[PDB]
Each structure stands twice: as structure tokens, then as C-alpha cells.
Amino acid sequence: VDRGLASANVDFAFSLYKQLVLKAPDKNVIFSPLSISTALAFLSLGAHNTTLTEILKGLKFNLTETSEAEIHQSFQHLLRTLNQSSDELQLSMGNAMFVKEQLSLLDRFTEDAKRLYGSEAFATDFQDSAAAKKLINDYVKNGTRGKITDLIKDLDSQTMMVLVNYIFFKAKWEMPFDPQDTHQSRFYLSKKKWVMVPMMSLHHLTIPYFRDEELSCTVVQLNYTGNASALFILPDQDKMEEVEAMLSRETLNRWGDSLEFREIGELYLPKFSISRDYNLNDILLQLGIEEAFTSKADLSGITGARNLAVSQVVHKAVLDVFEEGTEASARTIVRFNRPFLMIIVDHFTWSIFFMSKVTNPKQ
């Protein structure tokens, strides 16, 4: 089904992670590799020549074993096995292109973007800038019945295109935490500083487990009812960057083959919510995607000619880690009272909904 897309999309996950952390050392991170991946793949459908191979290589594709034509259809297959799943699990993902009203959009592009990526573009008046932000923030607002803040805040009048994507999640643990078991406990920002958080607990729990003596970390798999699972990576004290500098597909694959079911006595995991907005222009520059931002840009697939450059690329990701899963409620010891990593991956296609580091559960 998804053998070659998944390997590209795990690779992109980690080089994205590596960059985001470099931007914000010792700070929380959350983002969606899958969501950003479909975004830059959607941009690539309107790309040509150097602007196009720059996006595809940056998405970590090998353009000697695959082609633009095959990627566009490998993603459409992927995107539609996610729209198959039941309402055990619900992935609310958004992918929008806002283009300067002057430039016409061939109905060839808005067409393909629909049937291939479920996304679309809209004409936009970036001269009335305040109302521009008005209706782009309104698009992200519609990813949740919940109310969220503003993703676009400062928008230049001479903006050509803003590309927007967001991700919202809804699932249930196979093994929910009991709220009666959720207690106040310490979370150790450092070996000497700490903070009080809600601490979810389970006891006498047989779940996939692996103690990595090599990388000095501990890995557990918490399943959702849908065909996804949460990977939780508890690095030893003072060893997060050694774990961080080993992250890669090969490392993730090793953890995946090394997990074994194990009875665990007690499991302690913070009850928390994590959400981040990013402007990704710097990070995509770092990843080799230059021509799409310059005058050298060849997005002629969108407009019919080379009149168009990416101005802003914005991502928003929102995860809840509660007792029943995403929704709130009415002896081997694994205690996540320390900065840790969290990787939520889908079992059908092997892609990564969320990639996250929690250095502080309410911050």
C-alpha cells in the first residue's frame, strides 16, 4: 500500500524536527509531518523545473526511484485511506492556498488539487489586508468545533501567496486512564527545577515496551482504538540531546522492531495539551527549498505563467493528551516526569500525524 511514500515521509519528519528544535532549543515542539507533507506536495503540483525538484527533494523523495507523476498519485491513495477510517479516530486536516486576486487560477489546478489532495485555492485581496487576515483565520477556525485563536496576524499588502495548513485530532485510548487515578505530581524541567502537573496513572498494564540501553531511553506504545498508536520516548535524565541526535527512520524502525509486550506495574503520564503555530519559511529555506520564494520561482502550474512566489507558509498543530484519549472525562515503573518525545503514527500507512517534544506540560 504505502511502502515508498511512508519512508520519504518519516525522513522528512525528523529533518523537520531537527530544524524546529534548532530554532527553539529547550522549548516544546509540536507539528504534523503528514500535514506539512501534503502541503508542500500540493504546492509541488503547480511547480515546474528547479522550483519543483527543490520541493520534492526537500520532502525527502529520491527522484531516481520516483517521479512527480507517481508522488501525486501515491499521496492521493494515502489521503483516501485516512478518509476511510471509522469515527473511532478522526483526523481533521486542512490545506489551503490563498493567491493574490490579480493572478488567475486555471481551473485545471483547482480541479487537480481537489481530486488529488482534497485541497483548493482561493482568490484573495491582499490590499484590504485586515479583511485578508479576516477570512484566512476563518478557514483555520473551521477545523474544530472548538474555538481557536488567530493563525495569521501580520500580513503584508504586497503578498502574493499564503499557504495554510492545520491539523486536529480526535481519538480514544485502548486503555484509558481513570480520572480518579489522576493526581498532582512533580515534573522535572531540570534535575533541580520542577513543577506540579496533573499526572495520569495506569497500573498492571501489558503494552508494547522497550528499554533502550544503547540510546539511554525507554519507549512505550499506547494504542488508540482507531488504527493508530502513541509512541512515548522517555530519555534518561540529562540525555535528551543524545536521543535527539539519533532520531531517524532507522532509529524509529529499530524501536518498532524492539518493542515487546510487557507487564508494567505503574505508568505515569502528564495530562496536558500542546499546540504550536509556525511560520515555516525559515525552516523550508533550511531544507533546500529556495526557488519557490524568489523571482526565480516557477509555479506556472497555478497561474499559467511565472508570476507567482510563495510569500508565507503557516502550520498549526493541536494535540490533547487526556484520560480517555483526546477528550477529557467526567515492579516495572515508567514515570514520565521528565522532558520526553511523543510520536503518533498511523498503522495503516505508517505515516506520522504528530511529532512532539514536551519540555514542560503546561507551557
| Adjacent-strand bridge partners of 120 | 96
Can you say whether the dihedral through the CA atoms of 201, 203, 209, 210 is positive or negative?
Answer: positive
H-helix or E-strand spanning residue 284: helix 281-286
Measured between alpha carbons, how far is 186 from 360 in angstroms, rounded to an integer? 11
| CA atoms of 227 and 86, how far apart (whole Å) | 10
List, by residue range, all CATH 2.30.39.10 domains of the chain. 173-269+329-361
Extract long-range pairs of 59-68: CB within 8 Å, 24+ residues apart: 59/8, 59/9, 59/12, 60/8, 60/9, 60/11, 60/12, 60/15, 61/8, 62/8, 65/4, 66/4, 68/44
Of 126, 99, 125, 94, whose CA–CA distance to 110 is shortest? 99
Kindly report the number of other CB atoms within 10 A of residue 231's CB atom: 20
Taking residue 49's Cβ as centre, other Cβ atoms within 10 Å add up to 13
DSSP state of 83: T
CA neighbours within 13 Å on the CB side: how many for 309?
Answer: 13
Q: Which stretch of DSSP H or E encloses residue 174?
A: none
Burial of 256 (0-12, 13-18, 19+ CB in 10 A): middle
Instruction: Give the cell for residue 319.
Output: 494535540
CA-nearest of 44, 46, 34, 83 to 66 is 44
Question: How far from 72 is each of 3, 29, 44, 116, CA to CA, in Å?
Answer: 15, 29, 9, 7
Q: CA 143, CA 251: separation in Å to the nearest integer? A: 33
> Which amino acid is it at 148?
I
Cα 150 to Cα 247: distance, rounded to the nearest angstrom: 32
Resolution, Å (one decimal): 2.8
CA pair distance 311, 99, nearest whole angstrom: 10
Residue 205, amino acid: L
CA 9 to chain centre: 11
The amino acid at 213: E
Residues 6 or more apart whose CB falls under 8 angstroms from that of 279 comprise: 312, 313, 314
For the domain made up of 173-269+329-361, give the CATH fold.
Answer: Alpha-1-antitrypsin; domain 1 (2.30.39)
The count of other CB atoms within 10 Å of the CB of residue 248 is: 15
| CATH 3.30.497.10 domain locations along the chain | 1-171+270-323
Tell me how the structure was determined. X-ray
Fold (CATH) for 1-171+270-323: Antithrombin; Chain I, domain 2 (3.30.497)
CA-based torsion, 76, 81, 86, 88: positive or negative: negative
At 52, phi and psi to the nearest 5? -80, -50
